[PDB]
Amino acid sequence: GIISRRDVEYFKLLEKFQIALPIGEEYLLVPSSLSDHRPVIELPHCENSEIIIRLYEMPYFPMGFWSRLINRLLEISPYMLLRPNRMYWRQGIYLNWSPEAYCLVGSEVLDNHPESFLKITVPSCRKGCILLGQVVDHIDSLMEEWFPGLLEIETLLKKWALYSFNDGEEHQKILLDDLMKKAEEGDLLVNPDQPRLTIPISQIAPDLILADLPRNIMLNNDELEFEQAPEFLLGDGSFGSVYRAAYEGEEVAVKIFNKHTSLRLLRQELVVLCHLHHPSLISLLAAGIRPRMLVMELASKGSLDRLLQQDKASLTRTLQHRIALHVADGLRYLHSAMIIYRDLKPHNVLLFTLYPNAAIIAKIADYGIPGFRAPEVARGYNQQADVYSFGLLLYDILTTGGRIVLPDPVKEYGCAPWPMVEKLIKQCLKENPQERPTSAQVFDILNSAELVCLTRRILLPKNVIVECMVATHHASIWLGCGHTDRGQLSFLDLNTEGYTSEEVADSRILCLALVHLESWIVSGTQSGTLLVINTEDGKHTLEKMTDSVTCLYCNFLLVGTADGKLAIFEDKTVKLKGAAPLKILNIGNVSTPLMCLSESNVMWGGCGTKIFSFSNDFTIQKLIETRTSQLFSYAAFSDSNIITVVVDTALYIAKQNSPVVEVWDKKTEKLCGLIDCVHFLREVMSGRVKTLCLQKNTALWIGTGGGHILLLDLSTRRLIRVIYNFCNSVRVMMTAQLGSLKNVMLVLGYNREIQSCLTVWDINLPHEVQNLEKHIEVRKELAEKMR
Ligand SMILES: Cc1ccc(C(=O)Nc2ccc(CN3CCN(C)CC3)c(C(F)(F)F)c2)cc1C#Cc1cnc2[nH]ncc2c1
Description:
Blueprint: E1 3-4, H1 11-16, E2 27-28, E3 51-58, H2 65-73, E4 87-88, E5 92-98, E6 101-109, E7 116-123, H3 126-146, E8 158-163, E9 172-175, H4 176-185, E10 188-190, E11 198-200, E12 224-225, E13 236-239, E14 242-247, E15 250-256, H5 265-273, E16 284-288, E17 293-297, H6 304-310, H7 317-336, E18 349-351, E19 362-364, H8 375-379, H9 383-398, H10 409-413, H11 419-428, H12 439-446, H13 449-453, E20 454-459, E21 466-471, E22 476-481, E23 488-493, E24 498-503, E25 509-516, E26 519-525, E27 530-534, E28 549-553, E29 556-561, E30 565-570, E31 583-586, E32 594-599, E33 603-607, E34 610-614, E35 620-625, H14 635-638, E36 642-647, E37 650-655, E38 660-665, E39 671-676, H15 677-682, E40 689-695, E41 699-704, E42 709-713, E43 718-723, E44 729-737, E45 743-750, E46 756-762, H16 765-786
Antiparallel strand pairs: 1-2, 3-7, 3-8, 4-5, 5-6, 6-7, 8-9, 10-11, 12-14, 14-15, 15-17, 16-17, 18-19, 20-46, 21-22, 22-23, 23-24, 25-26, 26-27, 28-29, 29-30, 30-31, 32-33, 33-34, 34-35, 36-37, 37-38, 38-39, 40-41, 41-42, 42-43, 44-45, 45-46
This protein binds the ligand Cc1ccc(C(=O)Nc2ccc(CN3CCN(C)CC3)c(C(F)(F)F)c2)cc1C#Cc1cnc2[nH]ncc2c1.
Organism: Homo sapiens (Human)
Protein name: Leucine-rich repeat serine/threonine-protein kinase 2
Subcellular location: Cytoplasmic vesicle; Perikaryon; Golgi apparatus membrane; Cell projection, Axon
């Protein structure tokens, strides 16, 4: 019946309907028209004491039983804890690795017995015990799943173990139920007529004592301090018969299979557990038969369902993200092994620590022992149903309480916004299973520090573009717009998203500043008018500048004009109409606009291609011509006007249309280094620098014209991260306060008719990137170590 693949070559359907059943080496089984007889098999051993014989007496073989059985047994291996010499018949299969590892499963007929028999013969060794365990597990699973009713009341199905007291005698039979009772009564089978003739109950039925367990899984009863009492019940009724106990000095959870059809459920759960080695799944420590027992690791902090209602204060954003990441990792692990977690809910998620930075926080458990079902599950599993269950779990994690005690999580429960988690919840809850992401995709989405550190994403009205923005030093943003010839001043409320606007100037508003005394906002427009508007009262003008006001800084107020001039006002001066600046001075010329200013005190500034510096005297101290960096940079980049200067210990200079950020020494006035943004972007796959912002906690934020954010570590200037997929062009970037001591970075980006957006990032984004990468590496190392 064996047919080569090339002689037949769809195949998945052939496997489904028991047509192909691939063997290996491009060979198909095709049970139909096989040898139909026993092809003379001589076993390595022929004595009673060297073999184990297990008999299944049945009234008949069900149709399709042997084909499915052989398909199941084709994958057996004693090393799954050499290539076998496989042989096939229609009703049987023979495997042979070695004289110490073989398995003969085949049909059998007794004299004067109409009933059919299935005989399993293995060597009397550990490998033979493992093979026997696998074979009987496969047979029992097959009968449970494909042929129910042959098991219930029995149904003339009997299981026998064949034994003898002396080599050379004929095998006697004992039912597995009677032998199971004797196994609890003792460890020996006794000849009723001659007590002197004794055999071990094991090694004729070694699967009844779990002798095929891995060496590290066998119970050491000398190390187990376990008492079965309701005082030690775990979850005062939950989790079923789960008890607290001590094993090898550590507190563990103990599941009891007593008072039921034990050694079938226990063996099934062992078959499931022993091949699952994953950091996100609860780990099996031991198993036993004296009481039918599973000993697993104990979760110190209980389950997630109890935490979501009792200790809501502990659910920080980092802890929630780590719990979600661990659960998604566990689901990916289960789905990669073709294993389905049917019912996932907060009750099934165990917590080991509440420390957000721990390597292991959450694990998935399925104890013994509704509204957490996919529509196709509720109406009627599938991996998409598990993805839907994970979406529900992530919704429950995101919301404070709610369902555990769908509508929009933020409006209904308060639930401070988590923009990139709500999108994942929406994707995971799609009704059509084929549109839902896979568990690997879900984990890949959650494995992103952009997901953690993205706090808000506010979208402005269409075709309204914003030239400048300034935040009140107190979640209120003033915007100077330029989508018109008459400049407009807008106000955006970042707590309750709300946009208002008003036209205040004849020309576009190029820059904004806040003067705090009373508080006022100075708008510098293209015509040069400095329009000072009260921040509490509605809509003064200061002395008009000779050209466009290109920068405003605010102590004093500094007005850098496009004419290369710097005007200096006192805070009390700007309060009155038409007041002249305290000073005016020339650093550049008509063609060299004063385009940036910064503080570090000493006031640095960038005008044309020059870095100028000044102290309280308002006189120029240092003039550094950056043009010379053409010797190290490219000429067209170093000849461009400086658009922003950032100073902490060295000057960081960005130039117009230039993808290179220059680093200059404050003391020697010499070029310290160059940062090539195109080089960094090519590692991920424009580069022109538009914004340049500094985080004092060791980070440089570079906004590019292609909508990317380069996070650099200003120590050897290594690349921390590249953030993207949020806009098409970064236009403004600045640090701000949203209240409640929340430090944020506001990125005004563009989605180009034109859709401009304001994105809020947590100030600890580089630290979160590094921490998440280290966490993922540690978890990967753990998964590799577990095998
Ligand atoms: C004592 C105990 C025994 C067993 C388990 C267990 O989960 N077993 C288990 C079984 C199956 C599966 C996977 N199957 C595959 C297909 N199936 C259809 C679906 C899933 C999983 C896997 F994990 F792989 F999904 C785990 C947990 C505990 C426990 C405990 C404990 C520990 N500490 C605690 N503290 N408070 C309470 C508490 C409770």
